[PDB]
Amino acid sequence: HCPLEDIKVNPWKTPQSTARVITLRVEDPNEINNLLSINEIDNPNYILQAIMLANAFQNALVPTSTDFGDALRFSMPKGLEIANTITPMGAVVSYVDQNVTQTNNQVSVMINKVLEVLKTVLGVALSGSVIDQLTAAVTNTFTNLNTQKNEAWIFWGKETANQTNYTYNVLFAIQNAQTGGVMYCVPVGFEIKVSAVKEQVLFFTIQDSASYNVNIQSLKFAQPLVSSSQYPIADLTSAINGTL
Amino acid sequence: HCPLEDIKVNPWKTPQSTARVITLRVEDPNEINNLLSINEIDNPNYILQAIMLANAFQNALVPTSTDFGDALRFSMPKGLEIANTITPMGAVVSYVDQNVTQTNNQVSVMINKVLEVLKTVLGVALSGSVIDQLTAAVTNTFTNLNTQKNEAWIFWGKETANQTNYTYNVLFAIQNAQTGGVMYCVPVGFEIKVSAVKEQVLFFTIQDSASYNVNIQSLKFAQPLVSSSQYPIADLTSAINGTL
Ligand code: NA
Ligand code: NA
């Protein structure tokens, strides 16, 4: 109806993504998996491979100390042991076991601190390709905990009047242009102490302020790609159930 | 080390879930899908079927009015039309096109209002089986928008100094004990007007206060179950790409 204007082009305006997001909550799996599986793939033929890596690193979870509470967390040491046993064989590119602390700071700051560690593990190129999911994943470690509180990847430890202990287990599988002929797998075990009662922590936002003492344990594992396009879907159903 | 106490059993304490959660972000799909696919399945043999339902209802998206802005939203009317064409054939159990409004109320209240509508569409039994994902999904419609802002399911409309228009498209596929021999599919098209500038809306939390004028369009579609355990994984890769 109106006159067709000449194109004004802002080179900073971010284009809308074309990426398809599919979340699966598999009720009552045959074998229990206590890792939140976050997958950034460009070829769905590597999904099976991604799931099988999550199945393997399930064995790298270990109980916390009694003084922390009754919780499971991904262990970097045990991760390395497990890594060796994984077939097809692959390489541990990097690993980390580091404490992160803050005092009377906003939750946003803590998220940034943790992000800084995971970005160091992933690397610039790798970080960039998964920046949205990575940020969201770390955000959902410290906030949005109410709807997550009873899920299989979060465990509540000791619960004093001044402090809440909890663990959080997330796994990233990455396969795209930045990965080439290998898929990257980055399990993360969070051991979190926060200066607030559970009731408050459950409804913590990025605006809230708190003191944190957090241990992060992670490693980056590169496994050569294996397409599964020729296998039946029964095999993927088996991988998800942990029976493959 | 310590004496084994007799069992104290609180019948209200919620048990930890065994459900496995897997999120897939498929970079650069062959065909674009603008629906956030949230799947609650107990048998992974119905995943393909779940994805194919999301592929179908992609065709039910329509542009908003020019006065709203340049956005896509799931249309209940067009949904009904599309529903007919879906094979294998199935039934539209229920549908809704309703406005929800609030004035100077917390975002939490709005979430509850929207939840009330979607719970009416799903029903008691159905709601209960997907209560965690449903709550999270609606929460993520009004909050946690920063990391979502450029994703394929959210569209930003007109952006005044007093108001922000945006649409949000989410789809629920449900198959469990409460569904029996059919899988349920519930697409939702949100057309949201909120009394805040985009910069504020992007970092809105449940604690924040705002006035909302929201149109919700949804329907419940029951499709008889079709296992895909015998088909190759190539077919699932094709369904995800929208080429199947
Ligand atoms: Na970001
Ligand atoms: Na809940």
From Swiss-Prot, chains A, B:
One of its GO terms (biological process) is sporulation resulting in formation of a cellular spore. Active after proteolytic processing. InterPro entries: CytB_endotoxin-like_sf (IPR035918), Endotoxin_CytB (IPR001615). Keywords: Plasmid, Sporulation, Toxin, Virulence. It holds the Pfam family Bac_thur_toxin. GO terms for cellular component: extracellular region. GO terms for molecular function: toxin activity. Kills the larvae of dipteran insects by making pores in the epithelial cell membrane of the insect midgut. Acts on mosquitos and black flies. Belongs to the cyt1/cyt2 endotoxin family. This is Type-1Aa cytolytic delta-endotoxin. It comes from Bacillus thuringiensis subsp. israelensis.
